[PDB]
Design a protein around this ligand. Sequence first.
Ligand SMILES: [Pt+2]
Length: 298
Amino acid sequence: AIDPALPEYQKASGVSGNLSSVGSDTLANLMTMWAEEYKRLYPNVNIQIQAAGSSTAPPALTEGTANLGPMSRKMKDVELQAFEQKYGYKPTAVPVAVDALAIFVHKDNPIKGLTMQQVDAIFSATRLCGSKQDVKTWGDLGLTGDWAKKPVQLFGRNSVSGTYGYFKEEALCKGDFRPNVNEQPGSASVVQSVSQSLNGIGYSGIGYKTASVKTVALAKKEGAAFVEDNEQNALNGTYPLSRFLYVYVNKAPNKPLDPLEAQFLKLVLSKTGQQVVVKDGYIPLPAKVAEKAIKELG
Ligand SMILES: [Pt+2]
C-alpha cells in the first residue's frame, strides 16, 4: 500500500509543548489523525487544529500563532514575501501527501468523462480554457433522455480554500467561477451536497470520496484519453489535477527545527504517517519525496 523504502518512525527525546496548526480543510482529517498518533507517542504534547482553508495558514505562520501551516497549494509569491519580510527567509513547504483533486458527480450520473474545456465551461463564467459553450444542462455535456434538460447544479469551496485557488488556476485557466456555484464551508459538505443531488457536480480532494459519489475521468482535450484519478496517474502527473499537499513550517536557514515540530514532521514522513494518508483515501508519498523533505529539514 505504501512504499516499502519509507522510514519507520522512532521516538525521540525532548518533545513537549503545544503544537498549533492553521490551514487546509483538505488536510483536516490527516492533521487530526497524525496529531492523535503524535499525542499518543508524546503525551506531553497538546495539539490544536484549525482547518478553515489554506489561505489562513500564511498569516498564522507569519504572525507566529501557528507552528504548522497545512496547505493544499503552494504559497503564492505574495504570501512567501510577507513571511520573508518579517523573518528574512522563506517558509519551508514540506510535502506530506498527494491528491488527485476530484470532480465528483452523483453515483447514478451516467457521465463517464469530461474534457478540461468542459470542466471550465461547467464551473466558470469566463471560459478562458476555450469552450464556446455556456454549459447549463447535462444535455450540454452530451447526456440524453431525461438527463438532457436537467440543470447542472454546482458545488464548490469558498475564497480561502486552496482547492478553490488551485482549481481556479488549473481548471479555469485563471478565470472566475460562475456566481451560481453553491459554496460550501469545507470538502465534506461539497461531497455531501453532490451525494444528495442526482444532477450535482463538485470538486474536492479525493480523500473525501464516499460511496454516494463517483469521480469523473478527465481528458486534456477532445480526442485525448480520459485519465482516471489513481495513484499511478497522480504520481506521474498525467491526471490533470494532481497536486501535492503540504505543511509549511518556519525553518531558519542554518538552524534546526524545535523537536516539537521536527518530530511531528518526521512522523508524517514515515510509514506510520503515510499509512494514515492511505486510510484517509489520499495517495502516499514515494520514499524519495519523503527523503528529500527530511534532508531539507535537517
Ligand atoms: Pt480517521
